[PDB]
Amino acid sequence: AENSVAYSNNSIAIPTNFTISVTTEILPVSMTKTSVDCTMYICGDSTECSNLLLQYGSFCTQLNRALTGIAVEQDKNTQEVFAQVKQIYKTPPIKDFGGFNFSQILPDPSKPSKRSFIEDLLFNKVTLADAGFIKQYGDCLGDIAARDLICAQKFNGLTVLPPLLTDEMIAQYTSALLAGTITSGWTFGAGAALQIPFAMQMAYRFNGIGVTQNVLYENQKLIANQFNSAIGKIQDSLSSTASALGKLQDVVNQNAQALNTLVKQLSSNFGAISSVLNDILSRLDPPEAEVQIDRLITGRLQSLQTYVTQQLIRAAEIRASANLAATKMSECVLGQSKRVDFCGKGYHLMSFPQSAPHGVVFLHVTYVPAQEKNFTTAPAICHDGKAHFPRE
Amino acid sequence: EKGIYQTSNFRVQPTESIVRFPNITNLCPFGEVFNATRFASVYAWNRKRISNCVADYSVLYNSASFSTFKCYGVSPTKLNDLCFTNVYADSFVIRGDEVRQIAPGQTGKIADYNYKLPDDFTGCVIAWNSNNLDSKGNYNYLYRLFRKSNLKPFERDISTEIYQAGSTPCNGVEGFNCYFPLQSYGFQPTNGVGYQPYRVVVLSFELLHAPATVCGPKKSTNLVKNKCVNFNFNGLTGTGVLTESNKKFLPFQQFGRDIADTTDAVRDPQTLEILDITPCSFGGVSVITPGTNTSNQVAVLYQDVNCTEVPVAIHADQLTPTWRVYSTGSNVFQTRAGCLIGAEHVNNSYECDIPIGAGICASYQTSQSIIAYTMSLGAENSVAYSNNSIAIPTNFTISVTTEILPVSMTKTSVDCTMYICGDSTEC
Amino acid sequence: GKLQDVVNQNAQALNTLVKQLSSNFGAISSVLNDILSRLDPPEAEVQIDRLITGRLQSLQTYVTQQLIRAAEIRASANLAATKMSECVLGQSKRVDFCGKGYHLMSFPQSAPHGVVFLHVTYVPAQEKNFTTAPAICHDGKAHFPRE
Amino acid sequence: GKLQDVVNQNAQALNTLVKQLSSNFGAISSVLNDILSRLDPPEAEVQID
Amino acid sequence: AYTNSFTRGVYYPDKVFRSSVLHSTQDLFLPFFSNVTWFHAIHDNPVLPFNDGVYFASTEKSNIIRGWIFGTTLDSKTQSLLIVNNATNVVIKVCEFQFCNDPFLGVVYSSANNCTFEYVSFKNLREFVFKNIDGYFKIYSKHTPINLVRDLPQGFSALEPLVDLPIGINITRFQTLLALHRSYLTPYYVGYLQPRTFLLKYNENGTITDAVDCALDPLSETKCTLKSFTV
Numbered sequence A: 001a002e003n004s005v006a007y008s009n010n011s012i013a014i015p016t017n018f019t020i021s022v023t024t025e026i027l028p029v030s031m032t033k034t035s036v037d038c039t040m041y042i043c044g045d046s047t048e049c050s051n052l053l054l055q056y057g058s059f060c061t062q063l064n065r066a067l068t069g070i071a072v073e074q075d076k077n078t079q080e081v082f083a084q085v086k087q088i089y090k091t092p093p094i095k096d097f098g099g100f101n102f103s104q105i106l107p108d109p110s111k112p113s114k115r116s117f118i119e120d121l122l123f124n125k126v127t128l129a130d131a132g133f134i135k136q137y138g139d140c141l142g143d144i145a146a147r148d149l150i151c152a153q154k155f156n157g158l159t160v161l162p163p164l165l166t167d168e169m170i171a172q173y174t175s176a177l178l179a180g181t182i183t184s185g186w187t188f189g190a191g192a193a194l195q196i197p198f199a200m201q202m203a204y205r206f207n208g209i210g211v212t213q214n215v216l217y218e219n220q221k222l223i224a225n226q227f228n229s230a231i232g233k234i235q236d237s238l239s240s241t242a243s244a245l246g247k248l249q250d251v252v253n254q255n256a257q258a259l260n261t262l263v264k265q266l267s268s269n270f271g272a273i274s275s276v277l278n279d280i281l282s283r284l285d286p287p288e289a290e291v292q293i294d295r296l297i298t299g300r301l302q303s304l305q306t307y308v309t310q311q312l313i314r315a316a317e318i319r320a321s322a323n324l325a326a327t328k329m330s331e332c333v334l335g336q337s338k339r340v341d342f343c344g345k346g347y348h349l350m351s352f353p354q355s356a357p358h359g360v361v362f363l364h365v366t367y368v369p370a371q372e373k374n375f376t377t378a379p380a381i382c383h384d385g386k387a388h389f390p391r392e
Numbered sequence B: 001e002k003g004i005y006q007t008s009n010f011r012v013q014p015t016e017s018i019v020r021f022p023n024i025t026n027l028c029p030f031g032e033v034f035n036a037t038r039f040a041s042v043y044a045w046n047r048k049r050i051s052n053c054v055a056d057y058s059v060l061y062n063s064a065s066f067s068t069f070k071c072y073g074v075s076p077t078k079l080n081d082l083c084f085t086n087v088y089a090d091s092f093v094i095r096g097d098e099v100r101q102i103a104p105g106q107t108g109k110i111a112d113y114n115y116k117l118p119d120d121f122t123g124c125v126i127a128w129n130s131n132n133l134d135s136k137g138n139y140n141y142l143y144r145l146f147r148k149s150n151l152k153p154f155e156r157d158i159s160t161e162i163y164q165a166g167s168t169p170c171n172g173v174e175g176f177n178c179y180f181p182l183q184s185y186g187f188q189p190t191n192g193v194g195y196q197p198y199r200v201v202v203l204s205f206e207l208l209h210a211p212a213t214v215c216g217p218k219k220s221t222n223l224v225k226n227k228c229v230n231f232n233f234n235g236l237t238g239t240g241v242l243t244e245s246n247k248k249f250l251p252f253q254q255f256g257r258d259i260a261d262t263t264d265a266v267r268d269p270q271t272l273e274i275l276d277i278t279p280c281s282f283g284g285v286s287v288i289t290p291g292t293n294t295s296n297q298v299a300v301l302y303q304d305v306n307c308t309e310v311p312v313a314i315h316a317d318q319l320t321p322t323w324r325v326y327s328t329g330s331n332v333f334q335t336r337a338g339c340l341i342g343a344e345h346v347n348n349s350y351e352c353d354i355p356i357g358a359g360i361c362a363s364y365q366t367s368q369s370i371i372a373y374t375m376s377l378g379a380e381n382s383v384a385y386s387n388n389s390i391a392i393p394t395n396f397t398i399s400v401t402t403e404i405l406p407v408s409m410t411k412t413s414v415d416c417t418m419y420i421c422g423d424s425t426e427c
Numbered sequence C: 001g002k003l004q005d006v007v008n009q010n011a012q013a014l015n016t017l018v019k020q021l022s023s024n025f026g027a028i029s030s031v032l033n034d035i036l037s038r039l040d041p042p043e044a045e046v047q048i049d050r051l052i053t054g055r056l057q058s059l060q061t062y063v064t065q066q067l068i069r070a071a072e073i074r075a076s077a078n079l080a081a082t083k084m085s086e087c088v089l090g091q092s093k094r095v096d097f098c099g100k101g102y103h104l105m106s107f108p109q110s111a112p113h114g115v116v117f118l119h120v121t122y123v124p125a126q127e128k129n130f131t132t133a134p135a136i137c138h139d140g141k142a143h144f145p146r147e
Numbered sequence D: 001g002k003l004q005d006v007v008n009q010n011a012q013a014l015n016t017l018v019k020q021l022s023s024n025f026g027a028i029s030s031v032l033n034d035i036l037s038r039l040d041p042p043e044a045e046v047q048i049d
Numbered sequence E: 001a002y003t004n005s006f007t008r009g010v011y012y013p014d015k016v017f018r019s020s021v022l023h024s025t026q027d028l029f030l031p032f033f034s035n036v037t038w039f040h041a042i043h044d045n046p047v048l049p050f051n052d053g054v055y056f057a058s059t060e061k062s063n064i065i066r067g068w069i070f071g072t073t074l075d076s077k078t079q080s081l082l083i084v085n086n087a088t089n090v091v092i093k094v095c096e097f098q099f100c101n102d103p104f105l106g107v108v109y110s111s112a113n114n115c116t117f118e119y120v121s122f123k124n125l126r127e128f129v130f131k132n133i134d135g136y137f138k139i140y141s142k143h144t145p146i147n148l149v150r151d152l153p154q155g156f157s158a159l160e161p162l163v164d165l166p167i168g169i170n171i172t173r174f175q176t177l178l179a180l181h182r183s184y185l186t187p188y189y190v191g192y193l194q195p196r197t198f199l200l201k202y203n204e205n206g207t208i209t210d211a212v213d214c215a216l217d218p219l220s221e222t223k224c225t226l227k228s229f230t231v
Ligand SMILES: *[C@@H]1O[C@H](CO)[C@@H](O[C@@H]2O[C@H](CO)[C@@H](O)[C@H](O)[C@H]2NC(C)=O)[C@H](O)[C@H]1NC(C)=O
Pocket: A017, A018, A019, A222, A225, A226
C-alpha cells in the first residue's frame, strides 16, 4: 500500500492507546535418525558378492561413521534447546495472576500425558500419510497381531532409530520453563528462582520498554482482557483447517523423498543383464559373473554415496536453526530482548514456548502502539535567559 | 572405549538346499533333431516348438559329436537347473567358414541375406562337421543370395522372383543387373576345412517366466520350514527363511514382489502353497560396553525386536555357546528401542551415562554389573508463589566460568598425480 | 574435548585416504608396477583404468567431506569473533551469551586451534521473604517507586 | 570485491562443466556422432557407456 | 458412428503380485477418452484391420454373438484363426477354410485341408482384448454387469486374463460371426490399441483400483512425473 508521512519541522505524533499482540514463530530443531546396512543394501545374503565388495576397501565403515555422526548430532540439537534449566518447577495449585488466564498453555491435569491444549492442536497438524518409506516402517511397531515379525530385515537394510528424549520428557521440560517464567520472572535463568506477583512483574516489563509503570496499574483489566482475547485467536486459528506448520512438514517431506529414491534405485541394472542378483548368480559361471556383479556393485555404491552426501548438507542446516532456537529460548523466554524484531514485531514483553513434532513454537507477547494525535513540539524552553530541556 | 557401538555381522551359519519342481514325466524330441538325415537348407530353416520335457543337457554337450558349443545368455554348465518355457530348435547346413556368421552382430552372406540372430539373444549354438554324410558332389543344398533390403532378425523369405539392379524390369531374364536369387553349394569331398558341409543347430528361449515347463533332471526335495536355505523354484533361486503366508493371490500369480523389484512371496509348484521369504543376516545388533581398560562385560541390544523372539531371529542354536549366553537369561528387558539382554534393570533414576534410546540409559555401577534405568531430567522444585510476597537477595557470588571454541583447522594439500600413480608415465 | 575432536577427525580422514591405496577395485593387483611388469599395454590399459577411477573416487570423497567440515569451522569462528567484540570489548545484556549470571567482564586466552573465554559474572544468593505492594496511598494520591 | 567473488566463482564453475565435454574418458572419441557413424550398435554400447 | 470410451481397456499386463503400491508400466493399451465405432448390423459383418491390437466389448442379451475369425488371405492360402462356441464350451481352431462373403453360424461351411493345432475349453458385458506378439496370442477379458442398455459406463474395471495361444503366425485383418436361425450358403464395439504409458494403482490383495494416462493432458503429465495421484 502506498503511503506518505506528514513531515514538518515542528510537528510530532504521539500514541494514546495500545494493543497487546500475540504472534507465533515455528522453528525446526531435529530430524529423523536413520541407519543403513551397507552389505544388506548392496548384496543381501550372498557370499559371492560379499567377497567382491571387500576389494573396494573401506567404503562402508566410512558411510556408517558419517550416518552415526548425523544421528548423534540430532540429540544434541534437542538437548541444547530444551534442557536449559535443571530444576523441574511445578505449576502452583492456586492461580491468581491478576486476571491473566494461562489455562490453554499450562499442562492438562485430566489427561495422562503432560501436553496442553495448544500442544495437542499442534501434534495433529503434522502428518505422515504421503510419506513413502517412513510410514511403511512406522507400521511395523503397530503390527502387534503378527508373531515372527522381525522387520529390521525387511526393508533392504534401512532402519529408523528412536529419539533419546521421548515426547513426554520434552513436554515436561517446556512445562518447567512455563512454570518458572510465570511465577519467578527472569530471575530463574540467572541463579535461583525468586517469586514476584504477576502484575508487579508486568509492570517492570512495561518499564523496560519505556512506558512508566502506572499505566499497567491503571489499565490492568483492559490489558488482561486483551491478552486473553489474543490467546483465544491463536487457538481458533490453529483449530481450523489451515496449513499452519509448513516449515515442520517440509522437513518430513524432504526426508521421505530421499529415502524413497534409495529404494527405487534398487531396480536399475546399470548396464548388467538384470537388476536382480540371484538371476546373475543362477544363470552364469563365476568366471563370467563378476563383471555384471561389479557393475551392480559400482552403481549401488554410487547411490549410497549420493544419499549420504545430501544428508550431510541437509543436517548442516538443521544445526543452524537449532542454534537459532537455542538463542531465542535464552533471550526471548529467559529474559526480555531489546533487539528489534528478534522476538516478534513490536516492543517485546514476554514469550512462552510450546513443543511441536521435531520443533518448537514461540508465542511472543509484544506491545503495539495505537491511535495517535498530531501536536506541536519544540526542542527547549527559554525562561530567564536559560534553556530548559526535558529530562525524559 | 566406553560407549554403544553398532557391530557388523560376523557370525557364520551352516546352510542347506531345497529344490521344488512340478510333476512332469515325459521326454521330448532331442533324439531325432541331432542325428537326422534330411536337414533343411539355409534360406528355409526349420523350426520346432518344444514343450513338456525333463530333457537333460549333459547328454548333449558331453557327447563329443559336436565341434563348437557357444552358448550366449546362460553359462553352459547350469543349463540343467532352469526352466525355459519354450525352446526353438532350428536346423540348416552351411559352409565351414560361415559358422562365425551365426553369432549376434555379424556380416557376410548368411547374417545379412539368409539367417539373422537378434542382438538381444539368449540361446546356445551347436555345430559339427558332416563330411562323411552330405558329400557324394551333392547339389541338393541351396542358399539365397540377393535381396533388395536387409534381413530383420528371426524372419524367413522364400521367393524366386529375380534380382533388379538397374531400371529394366527383367521378367525372368538373366541379363545384366538382373540375376536369379538361389544358387547351389559345391560340396565335393576334395576340399579343406572351411568348405565341407556342417550341421548347425541353434536354440532359443527366454527365462524368468511364470508357467514355465521345459526343465530337466533336478530332483524334488521337501521343505525344512524356517531355516536358512538356498531354495530353487522352477529356476528362480535365493537364500532366506521360508515362512508360511497369508497373501490373497489370484488363480495365476506365480510370485510377488515389492517396491524394490525383489521377490518376497513364491508359490509352491507342487502343493500350490504360498511361501513368504525373509532374509537371514540380522545385522542390527548393538553392544553396550564400558571401557575394556575397566572390564570385559558387555550388554547387547537387539534393535526393534520383541524379547520372546530373540533366539528365533538371531538363529541362536547354530551359534557358539558364548553367543547363546546373550540370548536368554535373568537379564532380559523390553525397551521401546528393542530387547536389551545383559543389564540389570533397576527402579532408580540417575543422569544419563550411555544413551540407549527412548528414555533409557545404562551405566557401570558397583558385585559390579551393568544397570539400566529411566533417566532423570533434574531435581524437583516448587516456587512459593503468593500474590503479595517477594524474595530479595542479600549477598552475592563472583563466579568465573570457561568457554572453548574451535577457530581454525589443519591446512592440507594433495598432489593428484603422485597419489593416483606416482612417477609412472604409462599412467 | 572440542579442540581435540577436530584433530582426531582431521587425522582419521588422512589415515583412511592412505589405507585406501591398498585396494585393487577389481584389477589383478593393487601395485601399479606389478601390473606394468607382467603385462603389455594392450591389456594393461584395462587394469590401470580400473585403478584410476577407484582412486579418483577416494580423492573426491575426501575433498567433499573437507568442504563440509570447513563450512562447520567457519560458523564457529564467526561466533568467537562476535563474542570477542561483545563480551570482551564491551558488556553485553544478552542473556546467557557471555556466561550464566549477569555479565561483568571477560578475558581471552589462546589455545591450540581455538580460543578460551573466562567470563566473570554476578550471581545472587542468600534470599529472604518479604511482603510487597504496588503503590502507597498518602493523601488520596498514589505513590510509585522511582527504581 | 565480495560481490565480484561470487560471480567469478559461478562463471568458472560453469566453464569447467562445459570444458569437460571434450574428454573421451577412455573411449575412442569425445563425439557421439563419430562413434555412431563409425561403429555398429553391438559395439558402440561399450564406447558410449 | 463414434462413441466415447472413458476408462475401458485396462488389464493386468503381468503375472506378479503387488500389494498397496503405485507401479508404472509401458505397454499397449487403449487411450483414455477415445473413439469407438458404434456397430449394429441390422438392415453387415465386414472385415476390419488389425493394426496393433483390437479392443472388443459388447452389451448382449441372449448370446447372439458367437465368435470371430482372424486372418487376411481367407482362401486357405495362408493361415487364419477361428474361435467359436458350441453353446457349452469354447472351441479354438486355427485352421484354414474358404470364408464366405456372408459368414455366420446357423441354428456351417467349414472345409479344412492343412493346419497346425486346435484347442477346446443387457445383463452382463463381455470385454475382450486381442494382442498378437511374436510367439503368442493372448485373450484378456472383462465380464462385468451393467444397467445401461447400449453404451459403455463411466466405471473402471480390469480383471484377470483367460488364455494364451502359442501360434507364432501373422494376422492383418479380422471379422466376426453371428448366430442366425437359418443355415445359408450364399456368396458390439471395436477399438484399436496404442503404445501409451500408464501409472496404475494396486490396493491390498493386489487389485487394480485406478489408472492414470500419462499423455492425455498436461495435468496428467504432472501426475505422471510426480508419481502420484494428488497435485
Ligand atoms: C483503548 O482501546 C480499547 C480496545 O483496544 C478500548 O476498549 C474498548 O472500548 C469500547 C468503548 O468503550 C468497547 O466497545 C470495547 O468493547 C472495548 N474493548 C475492549 C477490548 O475492552 C478503549 O476504550 C480505548 N481507550 C481509549 C481512551 O480510546
